[PDB]
Symmetry: C4
Subunit: 108 residues, 4 copies
């Protein structure tokens, strides 16, 4: 599943570290699991970038759905655009925090 590498990719993007983000992405492309990489990058776009740059989510979902159809090797070019966009995007996890607060606030 390469969950260790997926975690390193999320930390790299959260830390706005574009060279490390591309390195961990390269390791996942060589391993060949496009579905798990597309799923994690979609979650990162909404969790870590979120409301700071809504257009990053449009470009991420569009590229990753197209990538899963095109398949490797050409899919690596679509993924490269996504990873650079997310690593160098303004970022806010406030949507994630607000959602979990609303769930915690429900009467039990």
């Amino acid at each position: 599943g390469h969950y260790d590498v997926l975690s390193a990719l999320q930390k790299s993007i959260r830390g706005s570290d574009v060279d490390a983000s591309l390195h961990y992405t390269a390791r996942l492309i060589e391993a060949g699991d496009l579905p798990s990489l597309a799923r994690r990058l979609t979650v990162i776009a909404y969790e870590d970038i979120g409301l700071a740059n809504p257009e990053a989510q449009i470009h991420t979902v569009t590229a990753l759905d197209a990538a899963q159809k095109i398949g490797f090797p050409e899919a690596r070019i679509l993924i490269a655009n996504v990873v650079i966009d997310l690593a160098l995007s303004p970022k806010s996890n406030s949507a994630y925090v607000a959602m979990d607060k609303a769930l915690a606030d429900l009467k039990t």
Copy 2:
């Protein structure tokens, strides 16, 4: 009617209330009906005041249905906050229902 309470809260630009009713609807467990209603709200209550909100809403909700819970709640949160904060218009909805009434 929790879906109608969510629509009223988004129309009123009330982020905290909108997320409260969203949390209740996530726990009630009908994602298709929540997604359908948020899509309608984006075109009915935001509409021409902020067309980008419709692209954000449809993109996030289609992706949310594909990734499922638990992560779908994060995508839904982005949609609900966007719609609650967005400028508001009912002009396209009104124009359409005026034109349909004119046929009779």
Copy 3:
């Protein structure tokens, strides 16, 4: 097929006549053929608006694909946004003309 009403809708949008565009759209919604209405509005977005407003095509395809899933009656609200957008959009059919010129120019 209501091809007469679909033709009147295209002429209404080409002529930037928003009230006539909504009237012909209303007639097609009452008739109930969402697929034929979605197909014609997609072609109008690329043929008549085209390169003058590329974002009109993104908003049109997004709304109409969502509409065909939601179904009437709520689909009328999505379609209303599309028809007003296209009727009041800047317009150029230059992509249509250039494509047909390139086909006519091929050696035979």
Copy 4:
């Protein structure tokens, strides 16, 4: 190689030549291969210079495959002119292949 001639014409920002090779490819009749290549060109040759071009390209080509000919040629024309006129970047492509080479 007509697909490679189309890529060279788009890279050179040559609208007339790009539409010439597109017309040849439409008549040759393989829409899936033309759509795949134009999608790759949008991310490889335009890339970060104009991200909107990728949204336009994927949206139009998916719709073109769904509506078929004859109308698909109009959607394809919008894509090819957009990519030929667009600002050009290979920076994302290069960065990705540099990172993959660094693994070895």
